[PDB]
């Protein structure tokens, strides 16, 4: 029922650096066109958290909006001998890559975007762990998102926030405490969040809340060309000026001038938009990003 999932907050840029050959439909993502780094996120049921918060930013959008920094290095070469510095983080993730991707990206332990990358004419294997030369379809021009997540800006300092999980010895690459006894091992889907000045915080339970507002990213605006994405910053506030004429719903017209039959664009409140906060060791905090990933977890017996 939501027709505006492609009208993106931020840059709406769903490409990874070094793969710019689909910039026409990924830079920015908009109503028209296909974008191999973004469209998979909208496949019903594949990315349920993002699809519940689809007017918030993707990982690539948050990277290009300068909310999340890129890891150093920003891509790992899977063909190499020693492998790549990402290998430890990647191997503890259980992932399924569709065919025909050359690249895949994830939010690493430092809260930065890392990626695994194949050479020219090489594709990722199905487990996302190796590269291979298959004689088949052309490769996609973008990068596959490895985690189900969404992002937003935040100034809330998380420098004192740390993973705390009852009875866990290891989760992904995080060893939580000494355990010299016998352990049980499983792949688990674990929620996590990243905060300003924090590392990745894995969590035992996901408890989220959303505060709606009338900030610019709480709206999606479109004009008629075919639909076209429109920059809300052009719309005059009540009592102010702009470069375009706009109109919209009651929430929009509470803050912006609405010119009805002369407007160049229509703006409406984005389902689910607002500040999402997350509960972490009993306290509500404003994260940079929230997501799920599937990682090895070892627990005390």
């Amino acid at each position, epitope marked *: 029922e939501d027709p505006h999932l492609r009208n993106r907050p931020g840059k709406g840029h769903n490409y990874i650096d070094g793969m*710019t*050959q*689909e*910039d*026409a*439909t990924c*830079k920015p993502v908009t109503y*028209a*066109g296909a974008c191999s780094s973004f469209d998979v996120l909208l496949e019903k049921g594949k990315f349920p958290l993002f699809q519940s918060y689809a007017h918030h930013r993707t990982l690539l959008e948050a990277v290009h909006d300068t909310i999340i920094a890129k890891a150093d290095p920003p891509s790992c070469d899977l063909q190499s001998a020693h492998g790549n510095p990402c290998m430890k983080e990647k191997l503890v993730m259980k992932t399924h890559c569709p065919n025909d991707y050359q690249s895949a990206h994830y939010l690493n332990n430092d809260g930065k975007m890392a990626s695994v990358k194949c*050479p*020219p*004419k090489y594709e990722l294997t199905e487990d996302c762990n190796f590269c291979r030369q298959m*004689t088949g379809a*052309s490769l996609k*021009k973008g990068s596959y998102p490895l985690q189900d997540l969404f992002c937003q800006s935040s100034e809330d300092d998380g420098s004192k926030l740390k993973t705390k999980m009852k009875g866990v010895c290891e989760v992904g690459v995080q060893a939580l405490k000494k355990c010299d006894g016998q352990l049980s091992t499983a792949h688990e889907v674990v929620p996590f969040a990243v905060f300003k000045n924090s590392k990745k915080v894995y969590l035992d339970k996901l408890d989220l809340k959303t505060e709606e507002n009338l900030l610019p990213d709480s709206f999606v605006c479109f004009e008629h060309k075919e639909l076209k994405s429109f920059d809300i910053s052009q719309c005059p506030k009540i009592g102010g000026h702009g470069s375009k004429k706009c109109t919209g719903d009651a929430a929009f017209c509470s803050a912006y001038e609405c010119t009805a039959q002369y407007a160049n664009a229509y703006c409406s409140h984005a389902n689910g938009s607002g500040i999402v906060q997350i509960q972490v060791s009993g306290v509500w905090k404003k994260p940079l990003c929230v997501g799920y990933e599937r990682v090895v977890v070892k627990r005390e017996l």
Partner: antibody
Amino acid sequence: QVHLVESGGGVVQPGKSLRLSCAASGFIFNHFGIHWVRQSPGKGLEWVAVIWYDGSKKYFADSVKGRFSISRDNSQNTVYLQMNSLRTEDTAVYYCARERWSGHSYLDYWGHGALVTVSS
Amino acid sequence: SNVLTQPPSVSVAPGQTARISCGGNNLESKYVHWYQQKPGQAPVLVVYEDSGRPSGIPERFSGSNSGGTATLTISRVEAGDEADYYCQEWDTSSDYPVFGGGTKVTVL
């Protein structure tokens, strides 16, 4: 059905200017870059210019670096190639051509060809 | 810089396959394409992304890039294929592509 119709190709003298026009139909003007590749009389192909899908990147050939400019209009689905200070060797059949991917890609659709004769 | 080298001219009898080469550095890595220009006409793309068949190209035409050399093979050569054939690479490091000199193929 993609069609690339070019015009503005005429007979001009050296030192003066011309403006090549490439109208495009059968696709989305916003999703594809447009190149200009000239072929001299009976010689080989030569890429001359490219304007990006959005016009943020505009690259020129070094033989016309500075003397040539490019622009595009979405309201008209048109690409203009302005050629100031034309030289005799610029005499060629110029083809505007769509590029499939935004950069480092192949040219999938070509135009009929505008003859620019730069004789004195 | 990056330069593409083709044979100046190749001739072949009808029906028999003909092969056109394109040389240069790191052709294994790079993507090589091929255009077919018949005289007095616009160049028509016939090979894209090494092996790659555009819509409207018969099985008689095929592209490849191996060992460091690109190749275009034409089986059951019809006389209506007498034309110029240009290979082209656009490396990621290059802000604009490179066309080969151009093979000039005549039917016998």
